[PDB]
From a paper:
We previously showed that TacT is a Gcn5 [name] (GNAT) toxin that controls Salmonella growth through acetylation of aminoacyl-[name] molecules. TacT acetylates the primary amine group of the amino acid on charged [name] molecules, thereby blocking peptide bond formation and protein synthesis. A third-related toxin, [name], showing 28.3% of the amino acid identity to TacT, is conserved across serovars. We show that all three toxins induce the persister state by inhibiting translation through acetylation of aminoacyl-tRNAs.
Author numbering:
A (entry chain A): 0, 2 to 175
B (entry chain B): 2 to 175
Write the structure that this text describes.
Amino acid sequence: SMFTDWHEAAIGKTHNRMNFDCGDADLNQFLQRHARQNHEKGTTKTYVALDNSDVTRIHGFYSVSPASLIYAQVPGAISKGLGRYDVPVFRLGRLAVDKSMQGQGLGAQLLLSAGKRCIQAALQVGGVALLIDAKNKQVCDWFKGFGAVPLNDQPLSLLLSFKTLYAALSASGRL
Amino acid sequence: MFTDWHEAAIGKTHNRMNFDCGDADLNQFLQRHARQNHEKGTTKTYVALDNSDVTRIHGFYSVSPASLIYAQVPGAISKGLGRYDVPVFRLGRLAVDKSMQGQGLGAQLLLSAGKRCIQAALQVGGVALLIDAKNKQVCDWFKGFGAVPLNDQPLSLLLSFKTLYAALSASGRL
Ligand SMILES: CC(=O)SCCNC(=O)CCNC(=O)[C@H](O)C(C)(C)COP(=O)(O)OP(=O)(O)OC[C@H]1O[C@@H](n2cnc3c(N)ncnc32)[C@H](O)[C@@H]1OP(=O)(O)O
Ligand SMILES: CC(=O)SCCNC(=O)CCNC(=O)[C@H](O)C(C)(C)COP(=O)(O)OP(=O)(O)OC[C@H]1O[C@@H](n2cnc3c(N)ncnc32)[C@H](O)[C@@H]1OP(=O)(O)O
């Protein structure tokens, strides 16, 4: 039942950013107004899930950028053995699926794709987790279902460690 | 310019004891932390190895992803009303053995660190190297490559990828 008739690419000028509605105006507007320009500037890189038949149709997207957190915010399961210093991460700044395609596994595939992409980059430049600011309790619970864990004093901000993500990629044959 | 060296990720074969850049904190980092931090993923360290002795470290640098709050970055323009970060890579360490200093190895490793981070940023973002200078002397060294201080921290500098890419493209490295 999982939707797989799509392919991943960097956001580009040919893609239909207007005909996307994930149900959250802020994410729709980011795709419309900011994703492509930010990608070219380098402030955040956005990747789209494109329909295999209509290559202009965006089924979903995610966006990443390098970041860091102070030691006080990081749960000990991640910071154990690292010393009392800033923790390098990648922020998953955006993740969205078009409402017409939701609940079909595309969000899960995109989260794992983002994690794989950041893990690969971290082999060159460092980083140990994805940092996620969840919009609400429901979204927070969605990320917790993949092993993301809340920051120490910010319950809606989560860390999904590359250790957790690597194990999930392994168990699902996605390495 | 000293060029009889090659670059590798820090590993178990390299001689981390026989290295002295004249700064004890940086020697101790190389001895105690560089390799373990590389394997843990908190910072990646790359060494300049003598072409005649693959265990001999002449210099090294270390990098990691980071972010800076808008308020620290000169000229940071916002697309929203809320708090935002400028995505960077920290150049956490840069050092050259005292016997090899003044021969352009530090400059070469700075450009190598910039190249490596620019290439990663093509996948995952980032716009500059962030450098915490040890003192005024080191601060001026980085300023010699166009590094600009943060707004309220004169010893912390940003070296834009715009600057680094121009040099690497001109020299054929990118
Ligand atoms: C960082 C931020 O931007 S936070 C804001 C996040 N974005 C939004 O809230 C925008 C609005 N919502 C959306 O875009 C989407 O609904 C998302 C991204 C939240 C969810 O993605 P969707 O594609 O809608 O749903 P999802 O990918 O969960 O599809 C469910 C399938 O994924 C997989 N899946 C979901 N959760 C799990 C899990 N915990 N473990 C294993 N597999 C899972 C399964 O295959 C599941 O199908 P099944 O439960 O029927 O077997
Ligand atoms: C991030 C941190 O860790 S801050 C702490 C920095 N590290 C230290 O302080 C440790 C102790 N010091 C050192 O390890 C070294 O002395 C360093 C890294 C500071 C300098 O590296 P070195 O290899 O000693 O010096 P450097 O690479 O500048 O050698 C000079 C050559 O570099 C090149 N170079 C240096 N500055 C410039 C410049 N502004 N523009 C162009 N080329 C330059 C030139 O080729 C120059 O040779 P020339 O002036 O004879 O033509």
